[PDB]
PDB file of C-alpha atoms and ligand atoms in Angstrom:
ATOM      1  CA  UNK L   1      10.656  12.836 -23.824  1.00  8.52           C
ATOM      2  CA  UNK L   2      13.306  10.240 -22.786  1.00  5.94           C
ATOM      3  CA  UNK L   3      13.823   9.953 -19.364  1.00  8.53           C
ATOM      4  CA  UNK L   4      17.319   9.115 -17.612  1.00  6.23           C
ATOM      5  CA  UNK L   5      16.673   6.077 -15.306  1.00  5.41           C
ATOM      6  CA  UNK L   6      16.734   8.380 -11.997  1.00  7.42           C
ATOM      7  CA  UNK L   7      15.226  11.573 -13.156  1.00 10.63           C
ATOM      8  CA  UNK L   8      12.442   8.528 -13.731  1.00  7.54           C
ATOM      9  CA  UNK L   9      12.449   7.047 -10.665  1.00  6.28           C
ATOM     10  CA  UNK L  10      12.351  10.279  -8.714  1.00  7.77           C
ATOM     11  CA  UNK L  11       8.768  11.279 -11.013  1.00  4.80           C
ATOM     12  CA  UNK L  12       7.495   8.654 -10.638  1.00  6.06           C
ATOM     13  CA  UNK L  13       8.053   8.620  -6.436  1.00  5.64           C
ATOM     14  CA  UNK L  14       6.914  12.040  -6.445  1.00  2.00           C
ATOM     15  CA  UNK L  15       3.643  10.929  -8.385  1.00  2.00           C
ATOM     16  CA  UNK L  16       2.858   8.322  -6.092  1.00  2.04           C
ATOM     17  CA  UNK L  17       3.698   5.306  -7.499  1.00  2.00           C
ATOM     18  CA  UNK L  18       6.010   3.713  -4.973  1.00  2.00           C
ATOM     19  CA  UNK L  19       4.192   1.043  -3.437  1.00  3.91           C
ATOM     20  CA  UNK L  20       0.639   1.660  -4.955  1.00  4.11           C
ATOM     21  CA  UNK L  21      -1.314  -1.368  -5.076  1.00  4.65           C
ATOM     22  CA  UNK L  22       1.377  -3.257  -3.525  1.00  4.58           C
ATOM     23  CA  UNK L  23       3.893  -2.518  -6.841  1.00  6.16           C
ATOM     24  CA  UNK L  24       7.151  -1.576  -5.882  1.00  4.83           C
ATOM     25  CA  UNK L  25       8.803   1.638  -7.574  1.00  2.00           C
ATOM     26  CA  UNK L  26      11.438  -0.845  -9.064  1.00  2.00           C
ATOM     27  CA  UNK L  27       8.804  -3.035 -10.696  1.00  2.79           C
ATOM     28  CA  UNK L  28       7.404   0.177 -12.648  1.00  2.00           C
ATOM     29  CA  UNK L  29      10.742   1.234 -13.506  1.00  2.00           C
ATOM     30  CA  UNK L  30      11.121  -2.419 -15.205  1.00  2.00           C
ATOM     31  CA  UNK L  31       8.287  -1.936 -16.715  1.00  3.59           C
ATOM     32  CA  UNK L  32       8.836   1.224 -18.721  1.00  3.00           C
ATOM     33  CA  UNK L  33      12.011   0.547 -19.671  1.00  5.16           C
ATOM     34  CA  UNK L  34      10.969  -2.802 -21.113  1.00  4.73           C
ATOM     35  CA  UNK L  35       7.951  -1.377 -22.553  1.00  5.29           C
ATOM     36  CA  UNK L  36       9.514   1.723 -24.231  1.00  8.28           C
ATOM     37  CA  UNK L  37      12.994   2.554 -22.846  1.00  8.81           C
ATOM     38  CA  UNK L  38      11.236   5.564 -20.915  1.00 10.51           C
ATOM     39  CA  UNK L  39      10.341   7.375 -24.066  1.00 10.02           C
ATOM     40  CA  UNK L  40       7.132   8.713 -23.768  1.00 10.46           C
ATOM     41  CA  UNK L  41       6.004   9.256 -27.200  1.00 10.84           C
ATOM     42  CA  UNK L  42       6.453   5.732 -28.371  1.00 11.93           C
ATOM     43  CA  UNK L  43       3.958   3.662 -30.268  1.00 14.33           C
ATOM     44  CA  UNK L  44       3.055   0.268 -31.541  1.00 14.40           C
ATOM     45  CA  UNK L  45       0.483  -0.520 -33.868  1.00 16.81           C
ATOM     46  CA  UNK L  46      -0.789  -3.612 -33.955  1.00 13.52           C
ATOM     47  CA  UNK L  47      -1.978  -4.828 -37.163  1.00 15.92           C
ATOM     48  CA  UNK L  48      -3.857  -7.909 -35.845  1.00 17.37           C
ATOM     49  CA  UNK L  49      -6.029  -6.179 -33.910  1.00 13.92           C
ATOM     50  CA  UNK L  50      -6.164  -3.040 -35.145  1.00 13.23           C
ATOM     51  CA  UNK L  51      -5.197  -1.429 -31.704  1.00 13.40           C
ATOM     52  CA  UNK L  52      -1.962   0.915 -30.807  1.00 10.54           C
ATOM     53  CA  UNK L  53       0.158   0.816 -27.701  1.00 13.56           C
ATOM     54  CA  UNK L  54       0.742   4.737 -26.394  1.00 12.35           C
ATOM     55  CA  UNK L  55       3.742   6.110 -24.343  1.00 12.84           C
ATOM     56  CA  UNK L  56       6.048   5.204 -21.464  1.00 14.61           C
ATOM     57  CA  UNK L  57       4.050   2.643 -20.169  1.00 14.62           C
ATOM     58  CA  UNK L  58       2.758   1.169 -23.561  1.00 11.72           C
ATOM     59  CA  UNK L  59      -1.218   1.138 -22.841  1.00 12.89           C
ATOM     60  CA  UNK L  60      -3.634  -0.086 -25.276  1.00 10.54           C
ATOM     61  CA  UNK L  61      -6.252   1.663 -27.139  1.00 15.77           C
ATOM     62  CA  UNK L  62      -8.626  -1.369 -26.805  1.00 13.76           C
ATOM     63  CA  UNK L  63      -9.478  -0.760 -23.459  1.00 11.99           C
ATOM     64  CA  UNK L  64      -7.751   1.938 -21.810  1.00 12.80           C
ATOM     65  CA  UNK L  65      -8.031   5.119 -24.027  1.00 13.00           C
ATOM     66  CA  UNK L  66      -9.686   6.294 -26.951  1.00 13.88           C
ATOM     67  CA  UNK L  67      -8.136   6.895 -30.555  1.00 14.19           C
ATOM     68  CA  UNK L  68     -11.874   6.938 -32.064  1.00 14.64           C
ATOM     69  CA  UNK L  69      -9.908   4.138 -34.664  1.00 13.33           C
ATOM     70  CA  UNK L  70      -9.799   0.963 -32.633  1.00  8.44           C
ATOM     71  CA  UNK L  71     -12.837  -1.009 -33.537  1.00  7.59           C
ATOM     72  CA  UNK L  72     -15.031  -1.979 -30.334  1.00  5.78           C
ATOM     73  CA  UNK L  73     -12.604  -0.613 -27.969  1.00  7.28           C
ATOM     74  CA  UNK L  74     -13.231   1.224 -24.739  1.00  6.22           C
ATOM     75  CA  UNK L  75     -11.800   3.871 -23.060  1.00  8.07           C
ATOM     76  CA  UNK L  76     -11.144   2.609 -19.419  1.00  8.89           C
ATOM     77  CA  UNK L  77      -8.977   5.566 -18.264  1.00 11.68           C
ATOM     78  CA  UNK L  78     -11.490   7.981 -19.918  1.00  9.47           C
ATOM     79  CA  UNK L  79      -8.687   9.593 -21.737  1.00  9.63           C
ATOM     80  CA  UNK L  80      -7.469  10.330 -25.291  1.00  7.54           C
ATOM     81  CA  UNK L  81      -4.368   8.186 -26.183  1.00  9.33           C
ATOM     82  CA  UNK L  82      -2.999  11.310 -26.614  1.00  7.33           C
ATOM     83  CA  UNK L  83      -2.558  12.348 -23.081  1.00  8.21           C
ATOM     84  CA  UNK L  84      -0.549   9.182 -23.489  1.00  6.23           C
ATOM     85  CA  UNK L  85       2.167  10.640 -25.480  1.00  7.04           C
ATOM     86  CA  UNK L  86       3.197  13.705 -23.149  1.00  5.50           C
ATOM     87  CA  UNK L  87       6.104  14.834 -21.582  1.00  5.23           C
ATOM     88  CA  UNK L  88       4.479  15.019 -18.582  1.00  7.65           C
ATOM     89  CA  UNK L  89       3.881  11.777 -17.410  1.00  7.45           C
ATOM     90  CA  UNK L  90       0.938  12.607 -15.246  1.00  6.66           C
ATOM     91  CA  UNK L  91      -2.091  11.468 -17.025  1.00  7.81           C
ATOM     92  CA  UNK L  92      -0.109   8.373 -18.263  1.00  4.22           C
ATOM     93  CA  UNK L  93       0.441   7.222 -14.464  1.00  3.99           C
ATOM     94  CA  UNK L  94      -3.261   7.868 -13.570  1.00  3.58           C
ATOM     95  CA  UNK L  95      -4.526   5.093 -16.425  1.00  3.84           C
ATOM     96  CA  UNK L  96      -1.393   2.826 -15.126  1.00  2.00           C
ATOM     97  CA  UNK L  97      -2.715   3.112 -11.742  1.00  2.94           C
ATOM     98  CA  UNK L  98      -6.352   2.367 -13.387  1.00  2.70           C
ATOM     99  CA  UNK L  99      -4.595  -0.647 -15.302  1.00  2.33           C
ATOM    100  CA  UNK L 100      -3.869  -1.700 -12.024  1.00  2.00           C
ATOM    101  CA  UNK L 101      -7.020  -1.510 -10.252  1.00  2.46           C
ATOM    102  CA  UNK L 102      -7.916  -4.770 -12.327  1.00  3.57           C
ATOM    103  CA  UNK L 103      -7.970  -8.353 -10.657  1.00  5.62           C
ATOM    104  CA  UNK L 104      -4.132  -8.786 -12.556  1.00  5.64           C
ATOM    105  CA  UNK L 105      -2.308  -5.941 -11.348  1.00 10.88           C
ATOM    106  CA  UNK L 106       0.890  -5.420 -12.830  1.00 11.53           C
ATOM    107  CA  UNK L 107       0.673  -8.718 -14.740  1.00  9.13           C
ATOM    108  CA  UNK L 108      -1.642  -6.683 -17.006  1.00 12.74           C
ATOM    109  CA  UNK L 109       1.719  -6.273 -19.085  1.00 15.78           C
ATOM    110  CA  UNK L 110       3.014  -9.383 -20.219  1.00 13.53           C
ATOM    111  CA  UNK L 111       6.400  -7.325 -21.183  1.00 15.16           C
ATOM    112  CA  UNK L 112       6.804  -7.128 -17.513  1.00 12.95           C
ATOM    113  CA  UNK L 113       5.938 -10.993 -16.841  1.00 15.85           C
ATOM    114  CA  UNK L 114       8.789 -11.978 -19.390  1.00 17.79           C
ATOM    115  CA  UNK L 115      11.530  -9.139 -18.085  1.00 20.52           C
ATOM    116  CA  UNK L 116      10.131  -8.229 -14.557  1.00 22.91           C
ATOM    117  CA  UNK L 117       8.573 -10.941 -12.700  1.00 23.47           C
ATOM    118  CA  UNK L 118      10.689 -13.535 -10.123  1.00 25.41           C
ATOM    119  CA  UNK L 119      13.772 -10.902 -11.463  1.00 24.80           C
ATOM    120  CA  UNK L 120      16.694  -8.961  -9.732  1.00 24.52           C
ATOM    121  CA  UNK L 121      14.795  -5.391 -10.136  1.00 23.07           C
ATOM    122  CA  UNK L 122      16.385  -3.325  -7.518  1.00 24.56           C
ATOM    123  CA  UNK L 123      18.995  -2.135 -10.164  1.00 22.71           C
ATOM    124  CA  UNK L 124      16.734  -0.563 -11.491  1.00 18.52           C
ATOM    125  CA  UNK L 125      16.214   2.001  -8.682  1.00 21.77           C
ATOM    126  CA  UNK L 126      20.001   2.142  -7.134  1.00 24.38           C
ATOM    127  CA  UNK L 127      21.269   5.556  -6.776  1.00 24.55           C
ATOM    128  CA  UNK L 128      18.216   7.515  -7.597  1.00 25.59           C
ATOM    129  CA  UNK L 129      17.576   8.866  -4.047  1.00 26.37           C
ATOM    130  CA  UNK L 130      14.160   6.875  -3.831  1.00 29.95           C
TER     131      UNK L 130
HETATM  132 NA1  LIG Q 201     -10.179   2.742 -26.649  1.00 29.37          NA
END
């Protein structure tokens, strides 16, 4: 699924993200739409590592979900990536939250340190009823 900007904002709200862990709604909306334009079956491989980035809000197989093909990686959300790649966002918002938990916070995403951080974000939330 591809979520309009507000329909986003307003699923997000509703799922408890506004404010959690001191993160603004606006900073997560700047996040997935930086990350994967709020399409939640996008992916990334990365041939580097051999690891793949799942969904809205791009996690990584290394350490936050298991694709049983990621060599040494964990599975710190205790999901399968593909809970990752649902319509429902609900799963994918619990491991974000988890992603979170960690000493960096949001800055766990370096998409969101080049587009998100010391920026203008409340555009990103105008109008949504939020
Ligand atoms: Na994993």
């Amino acid at each position: 699924k591809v979520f309009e900007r507000c329909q986003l904002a307003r699923t997000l709200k509703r799922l408890g993200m506004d404010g959690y862990r001191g993160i603004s709604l606006a900073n997560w909306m700047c996040l997935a739409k930086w990350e994967s334009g709020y399409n939640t079956r996008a992916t990334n491989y990365n041939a580097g590592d051999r690891s793949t980035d799942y969904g809205i809000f791009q996690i990584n197989s290394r350490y936050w979900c298991n694709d049983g093909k990621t060599p040494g990686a964990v599975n710190a959300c205790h999901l399968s990536c593909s809970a990752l790649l649902q319509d429902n966002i609900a799963d994918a918002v619990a491991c974000a939250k988890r992603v979170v938990r960690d000493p960096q916070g949001i800055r766990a995403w370096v998409a969101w340190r080049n587009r998100c951080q010391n920026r203008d974000v409340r555009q990103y939330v105008q109008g949504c009823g939020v």
